[PDB]
């Protein structure tokens, strides 16, 4: 819960997301609540391979499918991601956002930005599979607009979240290799101002 | 919301109402660089950072200025070193060079010169105190 504001989410995948007790702890949280945060956060941290090896592997999910279907994220976000279908994944964003993220007691503060990130990640992973793809070929059947699709992707460039090939006026769309000798050297640049912070700080009176 | 996102429309509405706050010491003169980043950072929010771009796609976001003067926007940032691009006069083909070969020879050496002098920086202070 404390990592939900920092948005680390990695240390909570094997602790908060992975629950040893099938039924909740009462005074801490709720049975439907502890099973809801496992699916929401698990899709952001655990990859698609770990979805079938962990989420459905745990017996806690099998008991939720045959009892409470009100979450709607078990038959929507899980199937659309496993099948890599963006056409069906788009309309389930708001339906889940309304019945999960809005009633959510933690992540309801910052929501729309958290959804827009995972919205492209489903399509970003599919981009690695195909080499050459036009703009209007399969995107017209996905039920989305071309203008709004480029607006969200255009703002992700300064965040260093796009190494790939995305084009609009022409429409030739390819994939790239984020592992190279550029980001390999980026580790040293990021540590430039963070390593010398405390070295020149306490070295005034002492040393 | 304006300078960092490179938006000219929301920048003019910010300077107009807050102009009273610009009457402080040297708070007006910093606006010269605030409106220049609208062009500089505006290139980054536009897809010009991507390789294959056409002018007809550029005129959409820059429509607030004009058509034929867009060639002056990209070319000005090329000499300064912000981004390199090639402009076509017919359809406005924009091919921007993306360098994946950097940080190989003499490029990291500028940073290596600093990492070498950090060892004896705090080490020589031990002999002093």
């Amino acid at each position: 819960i404390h990592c939900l504001a920092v948005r680390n989410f990695k240390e909570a995948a094997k602790l908060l997301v992975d629950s040893l007790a099938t039924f909740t702890s009462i005074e801490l949280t709720s049975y439907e609540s502890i099973a809801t945060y496992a699916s929401v956060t698990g899709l952001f941290t655990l990859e698609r391979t770990d979805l079938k090896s962990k989420v459905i592997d745990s017996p806690e999910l099998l008991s939720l499918i045959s009892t409470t279907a009100a979450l709607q994220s078990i038959s929507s976000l899980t199937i659309s991601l496993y099948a890599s279908d963006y056409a069906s994944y788009f309309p389930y964003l708001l339906e889940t956002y309304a019945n999960v993220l809005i009633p959510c007691k933690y992540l309801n503060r910052h929501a729309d930005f958290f959804v827009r990130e995972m919205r492209r990640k489903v399509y970003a992973q599919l981009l690695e599979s195909y080499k050459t793809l036009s703009l209007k070929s399969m995107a017209s059947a996905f039920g989305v607009s071309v203008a709004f699709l480029d607006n969200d992707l255009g703002k992700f460039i300064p965040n260093k979240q796009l190494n790939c090939v995305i084009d609009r006026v022409n429409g030739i769309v390819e994939t790239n290799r984020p592992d190279n000798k550029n980001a390999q050297y980026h580790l040293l640049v990021k540590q430039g101002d963070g390593l010398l912070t405390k070295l020149q700080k306490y070295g005034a009176a002492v040393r | 919301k304006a300078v960092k996102l490179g938006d000219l429309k929301k920048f003019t509405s910010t300077i107009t109402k807050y102009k009273q706050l610009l009457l402080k010491d040297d708070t007006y003169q910093l606006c010269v660089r605030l409106r220049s980043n609208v062009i500089k950072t505006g290139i980054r929010i536009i897809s010009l950072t991507y390789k294959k771009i056409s002018l007809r796609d550029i005129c959409l976001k820059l429509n607030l200025d004009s058509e034929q003067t867009v060639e002056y926007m990209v070319s000005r940032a090329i000499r300064d070193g912000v981004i390199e691009a090639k402009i076509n006069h017919e359809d406005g083909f924009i091919e921007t060079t993306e360098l994946l070969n950097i940080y190989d020879s003499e490029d990291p050496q500028q940073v290596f010169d600093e990492r070498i002098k950090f060892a004896n920086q705090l080490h020589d202070e031990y002999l002093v105190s």
């Binding site: 964003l93 708001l94 956002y97 910052h110 729309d112 930005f113 989305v144 703002k155 | 960092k4």
Partner: peptide, 27 residues
């Protein structure tokens, strides 16, 4: 948290329902 976290345009709700209605009317 940078500006992207505190931005919250609240435009995700209207843009999702609009695109679904546009595709159904193109039939």
């Amino acid at each position: 948290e940078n500006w992207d976290d505190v931005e919250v345009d609240d435009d995700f709700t209207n843009e999702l329902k609009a695109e679904l209605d546009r595709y159904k009317r193109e039939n």
